[model samples]
Target: GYGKGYLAMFKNKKVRFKVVNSFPDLKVQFVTSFPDYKVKISNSSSFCEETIKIQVVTSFPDVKLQKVTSFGDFEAYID
Candidate 1:
């Protein structure tokens, strides 16, 4: 398994999240434009409690984050 949630360091670590319509830790809205802070770049994991939790949503809610092409998050992927 990866690092557990109780640890202080999450850098360079990957976590999994699940979908729940009722109970949610965070909410995301659907929109065409996304602020860097408002959006997120997340990978896939069906469900696991030891990872992380965030809600799915629509329209400027602050969680409409999916996959993203980023900047400064990585700088070594050069030829």
Candidate 2:
């Protein structure tokens, strides 16, 4: 994974992501469908990446993230 734990949660895997402003691990963009991953935006807890149950919040320190328009690290669709 890119930078410690980037979208690798599956069958006992983990990653809980949230929003941030600066110093992000990877940049990303929001899309409607056909994304690199699928995770939740609210409920504030470990995020479910595609089919894995992760442990992270929206503002976790280990992994910092940012929302951008172009040059995305990967695309994700909110579920």
Candidate 3:
């Protein structure tokens, strides 16, 4: 129920994001970072229609990316 419950948590809220990567018309960024989590998406279902990518690197600060489905829109977030 946790997965489903989490998904329902943000069914009606506006989210923020930042661009991180792009290839021609494709782009990606960090949109939502989960609570108590440095990388997990708190409510992934909110982004059901878009592409989400999570990466754990050895960099000093962590980051995430979101690829908008409608266009070349992208965003990023440093956690």
Candidate 4:
């Protein structure tokens, strides 16, 4: 819905989407009119697919990674 209009605003009509994992079972999806542009999930063994792994030690003793699935043109932060 919103994605259709959002991508239309761009001249080249291109959009970028990034995915991160704060948990083991995180999944993301993108829906857009631009068939030429598509996003796919990384098939890595690590929970976080990025090359860099930074420690995010929270004050909260109990930290849990939650699974998330999103569709459309948007930004997602898993931390």
TM-score each candidate. Answer: 0.43, 0.37, 0.20, 0.20
Better of 2 and 4 by lDDT: 2
- Better by lDDT, candidate 3 or 2: 2
lDDT of 2 by residue, 1-39 (tens): 244355543323333443345554444543455555444
Q: What's the best-to-worst order under TM-score?
A: 1, 2, 3, 4
Say which candidate scores most in TM-score.
1
Clashes of 4: 0
For model 1, what is the error of residue 13's alpha carbon versus the real structure, in angstroms, after optimal superposition? 2.3
Q: What does each candidate score in C-alpha RMSD? A: 9.1, 9.8, 13.3, 13.2
How high a TM-score does candidate 3 get? 0.20
User: Candidate 4, residues 1-79: lDDT per residue as tens digits?
Assistant: 1222332343322223233336322122323332322323323333332322222333321221222233322222323
* After superposition, candidate 1 runs with Cα above 4 Å error: 1-11, 30-32, 37-50, 64-66, 69-79
- Steric clash pairs (candidate 4): none
Clashing residue pairs in candidate 1 (N, C-alpha, C atoms within 3 angstroms): 28-63, 29-61, 30-58, 30-59
Indicate the residue-level lDDT of 12 in model 1.
37
Give one digit per residue, the lDDT tens place, for model 1 in 1-79.
2122222233334445545566654454435454333223444432322444455676444334334355322111100
lDDT of 1 at 5: 29
C-alpha lDDT of all candidate models, in order: 0.38, 0.41, 0.30, 0.28
Give the poorly placed runs of model 2, Cα more than 4 Å off.
1-5, 10-14, 41-79
